[PDB]
Design a protein around this ligand. Sequence first.
Ligand SMILES: [Mg+2]
Length: 156
Amino acid sequence: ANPMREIVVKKLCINICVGESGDRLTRASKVLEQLCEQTPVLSRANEKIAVHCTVRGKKAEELLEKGLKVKEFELKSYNFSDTGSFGFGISEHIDLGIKYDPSTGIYGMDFYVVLGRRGERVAHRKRRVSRVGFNHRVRKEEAMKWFEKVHDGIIF
RNA sequence: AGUUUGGCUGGGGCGGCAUAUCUGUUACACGACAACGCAGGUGUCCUAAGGCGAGCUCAGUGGGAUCUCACGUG
Ligand SMILES: [Mg+2]
């Protein structure tokens, strides 16, 4: 329809919940740094439980492609959400292709990807904030269709 | 040897503090109003838990793998 209703990926959030503070977190923070080439931040309950980072842009697309390759380009139907975003997780960072050093060990991570159109600034700008609108909101069926068009594969 | 050995009090004593004080109610829509009336507090604590600028939004609920989106008059 309109040349302004295309669905694009907004951001990619990678989370690693080791559940501990110390050297394990230090290795995880480095591992995320090599993966996305961008400084991560630590999330605490205080306790310093987990580390995470958010990636948006082309490097988000490339990282999404690598994770989908591990997941064999297939996802379950209930992995999606009515908001318009989905996600998954991989268990081994070595299976991502990253070289193995017998010091860091093997870690997993959770991938979340948020989709949306180009009008989402209205709900986030400081001045004259408003709501998006029912038509412009991305539904689950549109999200699943978008995943079928590019990076095809789904199972109900 | 000299002197003292509290008060209030449905007698006095034992008990309690109604002995200096703060909130709601008794209290009768200005103000004031008693009982050993009712439900509870006070003798402390804080170089920040004081002063100001900026940024942000809480309790909770729902959909997804601590992270993410939406709702959310308190
Ligand atoms: Mg007397």
